[PDB]
Every structure is written in structure tokens, then in C-alpha cells.
Write a protein that binds this DNA or RNA. Structure first.
Ligand SMILES: [Mg+2]
Ligand SMILES: [Mg+2]
Ligand SMILES: [Mg+2]
Ligand SMILES: [Mg+2]
Ligand SMILES: [Mg+2]
Ligand SMILES: [Mg+2]
Ligand SMILES: [Mg+2]
Ligand SMILES: [Mg+2]
Ligand SMILES: [Mg+2]
Ligand SMILES: [Mg+2]
Ligand SMILES: [Mg+2]
Ligand SMILES: [Mg+2]
Ligand SMILES: [Mg+2]
Ligand SMILES: [Mg+2]
Lengths: 33, 129
RNA sequence: GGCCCAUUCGGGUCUUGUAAUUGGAAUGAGUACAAUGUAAAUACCUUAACGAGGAACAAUUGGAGGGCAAGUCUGGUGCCAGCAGCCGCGGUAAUUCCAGCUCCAAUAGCGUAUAUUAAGCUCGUAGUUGAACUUUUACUUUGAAGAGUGUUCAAAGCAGCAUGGAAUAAUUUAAUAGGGACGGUCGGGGGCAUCAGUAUUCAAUUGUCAGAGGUGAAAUUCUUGGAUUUAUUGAAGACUAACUACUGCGAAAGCAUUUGCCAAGGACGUUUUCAUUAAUCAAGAACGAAACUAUGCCGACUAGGGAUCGGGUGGUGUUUUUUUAAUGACCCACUCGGCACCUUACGAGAGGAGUAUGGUCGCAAGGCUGAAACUUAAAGGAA
């Protein structure tokens, strides 16, 4: 019970993930482009 | 706050895949969802899918073969240059050659490699891997 | 004999050590007959002669360790331990001393200091987000540090416009989205009247007489002008026992007698209707003595089980009953929506406890009182 669930491996870094979908900031967009 | 139908369909597919369900029912449908599922089917991330006409938006049922790690819709639908594509791939995906970014370009919706092949670009729709 | 490893004991390996003697060769810093350099001159490059063993032609900076006295100091449980030692009996041309103490690192560079990097609840305004379907612009495609070198090496120097574009964003369906309608209902939802209940207090009569309430004992209080208690009756306020449930209703706080009125509400059923009218929302609007042992990982999230409340469909045979009207209760299956309970598949959801104190600030001891400038009365205290 005490042990925290195993959360898998991180597979992306661009932006926050939400129910609507992954969201990218305008600042991020310029940096890539 | 409600979500777009494409986003809801993709979340349903993700959950059904991870729970071990072999077929998932998506409602409502749309042309965009059908094109998205067509791309995924071509690259093998799902099996057959069937469209039921209900005189409403309509319904879809997708058989899952377990090869789907994750799917998602990306917003805001920012534009991408053709030469820029590579950079975006390296950011949105796990590795160089694993996965397919899906783009809405002048010639329709298609994965990023076909977009390179046809020398067409546009906005990004979402990612699959 | 040297060196390497090893907390421990020890283990491993072999040309090592000198704090020994010695030879002839090379050359620059310098010092220079010069010449070149340059307006002249310095510097550079070149070069006669001099220029090396302490090659005294005498680079540094910093760290790690030793050891010594008829020496000095401090604390002890003899002969110790700690700090430490340019200082010792004599001596300064006196002394010849530990190897001139040993080792390590950078080196024309190397240390030090500071900083620095690795209440509540509903509604609701901006903002944000939000079902499906059948010309122009945004957007997008196309066209207008490195190469070489022999400065002796090196640092150097050196020869908006045109154009193609099918998606994406601007420029009929009747969502298991939303709203209303209709039907039988459901409810301890709300407001106004209304009804009932036993109880408490007071009062009226009324039988009897000394105690009655209260605490662990009391005190206080009532009481032969009759308390408490007993019977009958009237009035006042408050409240709604048992039925009372891990049940119902309401946005929350809350709501428990009957009957009527007033509007209101949920879910269910619908082959009725508008047709995206929506979601989340800081701002704003409506309503609105006490605590004192607790506790549940969270979510966009799968399949369930028992039980229960409200509604609907079907089955079935018992309660029910018959041309007055109404017309249910129970059992079983299915379904929608509720309050909870028990399980389950999936998910990046991004200081405590003590110890010591040659410091600073506070608080504190004692000698019998009386009683001292008084060796002093009585009465106490002690014994
Ligand atoms: Mg020699
Ligand atoms: Mg709210
Ligand atoms: Mg608004
Ligand atoms: Mg409808
Ligand atoms: Mg309605
Ligand atoms: Mg109604
Ligand atoms: Mg009522
Ligand atoms: Mg009422
Ligand atoms: Mg009354
Ligand atoms: Mg009652
Ligand atoms: Mg009442
Ligand atoms: Mg009830
Ligand atoms: Mg149910
Ligand atoms: Mg409720």
C-alpha cells in the first residue's frame, strides 16, 4: 500500500498534457521554429 | 469544460488499449476522426474499424491489436515549415524513427513522412506512436 | 636494502641507495670590435674577442610531517598527559651543530579573502473552452567558422515582389449537448392557516397528613395558611417520543402530528417542441460559546457484487374482489436515475530526542520570633 505506483517512463517534453490534448505554449513554438 | 470530438475519440482509444479491451466504441464521429484512423490503420496501430450510420453524427467501432502505445491531439494548431518538420519530430516523439507526427496540409491529413515525400506542409493535427 | 597493498594481522616484488668521488664536450643570458636596422637612434636578426661546476651566472609560491635540551608552562591517582620549545650552564670569531631535518605539488608563476556557477452553497461578469453535415486573406511550396601559405614553430599577417497549393482558421441532422411541453407520480423541500398529543409550569377545586426536592454528605428552596402525593378541570409556552433506517427531500444551513390552500422541485415515460441556445468562471448578487483523536492516496478511469429509494416494461400466482367510483400489496427478470458499502482493470498526477556550560540576564542560602542604636519584658517556637 505505501509504495507509490510505478509511473512509467517520460516520453515527451514539448508541452503540458491535458484532457483536451497536449498543449504547447507560444514561447515554445518560436523556440523550435 | 468539454473536449473536442477528436480528442475524446483519441482518449477513448488510449484507455481501451491500456485496459486490455479489444474493441472500443467512439461517439460522435467526423471526417477528421476517420482520416486520423485511416492514417493509424495504414501504419498498423489498429485493425479494421467500422462506421455505423445512426442518422446522427454517427458511431465508430475500432478493433485494437495492441500495437498502440499512445495517441494524442496537439493544440494550438500551430503551423510548421517543411524543413522544420524534423525538429518538431525530435521533440514530440520518443526517438528519431519511432512514431509518426500527423499534419493537416494542403493535400489533406497525413503523417509527416508522406508530407516530406510530397513536399507539402501546414498545421499539425496530432501525434501517434 | 628499496618500494606497493592492507582497519586488523600481515601480504606482494626486485638492481636498488648515496647526505661519495670524477671527465671532457655543448650553449645562452650577459659584456661587446663591428656591421645591418633607422630621418637619426633604440629594439630585432647576424657576428670577431671575453662570458660555466656551488655551472654563487645563487627562480619562486604553497602544503604535509618529523625529532632534540641539566629549557619554560599547565592538569594529575609517584616515573604521566597536554600545550609547546629562535629563550639551555659558558661562548658571538664563539660555534661546525639533525643529512644544511624529511617529503609532496605548480613553476615564470603561485597563494589568501569575498562573491559566484555546476466559512459554506447556488447563480454569475471578464478570460478560457465547446455536437455533426454540404471570392479574399492567414498559412504553406517554388524563383528572384572555413580554403591556401615553413612568419625558423606559434600567436599573427597575406593574396517587400512573382508564383503553385485539395486540408486547416477567418472572410440538413434533431448530440445517451441544452431548453420547454405533456402523463401518473414521489418526497420528514418551502410559505400561510388548521388539527392532535402526552409531558413541563401555573391556577381552580379535592382526599390525607409531615415531611418533600437535591448531593457523595450538605447548604439553599417549598411546607399544618396542607408541601410532595392522590382525583377532576382550565390556561400559557415549547416540542413533535416510540415507528427513526450507514433511509427520503433541499443548493447549503436544515426538514419528523393531521387537514386544506399557494406556488416550486427531481427522476421516470413520450414516435410531442426550439435547434446549438452550451461548459468552467476571478468580479458581483441571493441565502447562510464552539472544538477536543480524526485519515480517505488522486484522476480524464475498467468490469462488477449484495442491499436500498423513486419511476417504467414484461412475467406470474397469491393477497385483492362482484356493473357505485377508485383500484393496489407481495415475488421474479430487465432498465433509468439517486444515497451509501465492498471489490477490481488503467493512468508523468510533472527535524525529533538529549547532554554540558568559569558567558549575559533573572530567581535564590542561612542563622529561633519578639529583639534593636538596647545581650531587653511578656507571649510563642523548639526540645
Ligand atoms: Mg662534472
Ligand atoms: Mg459553482
Ligand atoms: Mg462569459
Ligand atoms: Mg434529443
Ligand atoms: Mg425540463
Ligand atoms: Mg410535471
Ligand atoms: Mg407537499
Ligand atoms: Mg408543508
Ligand atoms: Mg399547545
Ligand atoms: Mg411522531
Ligand atoms: Mg412542525
Ligand atoms: Mg420515508
Ligand atoms: Mg442503477
Ligand atoms: Mg440528495
Amino acid at each position: 500500500k505505501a509504495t507509490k505506483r510505478e509511473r512509467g517512463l517520460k516520453i515527451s517534453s514539448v508541452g503540458r498534457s491535458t484532457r483536451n490534448g497536449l498543449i504547447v505554449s507560444k514561447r515554445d513554438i518560436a523556440r523550435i521554429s | 469544460t468539454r473536449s473536442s470530438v477528436l480528442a475524446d475519440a483519441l482518449n477513448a482509444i488510449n484507455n481501451a488499449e491500456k485496459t486490455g479491451k479489444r474493441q472500443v466504441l467512439i461517439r460522435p464521429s467526423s471526417k477528421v476522426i476517420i482520416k486520423f484512423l485511416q492514417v493509424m490503420q495504414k501504419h498498423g496501430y489498429i485493425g479494421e474499424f467500422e462506421y455505423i450510420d445512426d442518422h446522427r453524427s454517427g458511431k465508430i467501432v475500432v478493433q485494437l491489436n495492441g500495437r498502440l502505445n499512445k495517441c494524442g491531439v496537439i493544440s494550438p494548431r500551430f503551423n510548421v515549415k517543411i524543413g522544420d518538420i524534423e525538429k518538431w519530430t525530435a521533440n514530440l516523439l520518443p526517438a528519431r524513427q519511432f512514431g509518426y507526427v500527423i499534419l493537416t496540409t494542403s493535400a489533406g491529413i497525413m503523417d509527416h513522412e508522406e508530407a516530406r515525400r510530397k513536399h507539402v506542409s501546414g498545421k499539425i493535427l496530432g501525434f501517434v506512436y
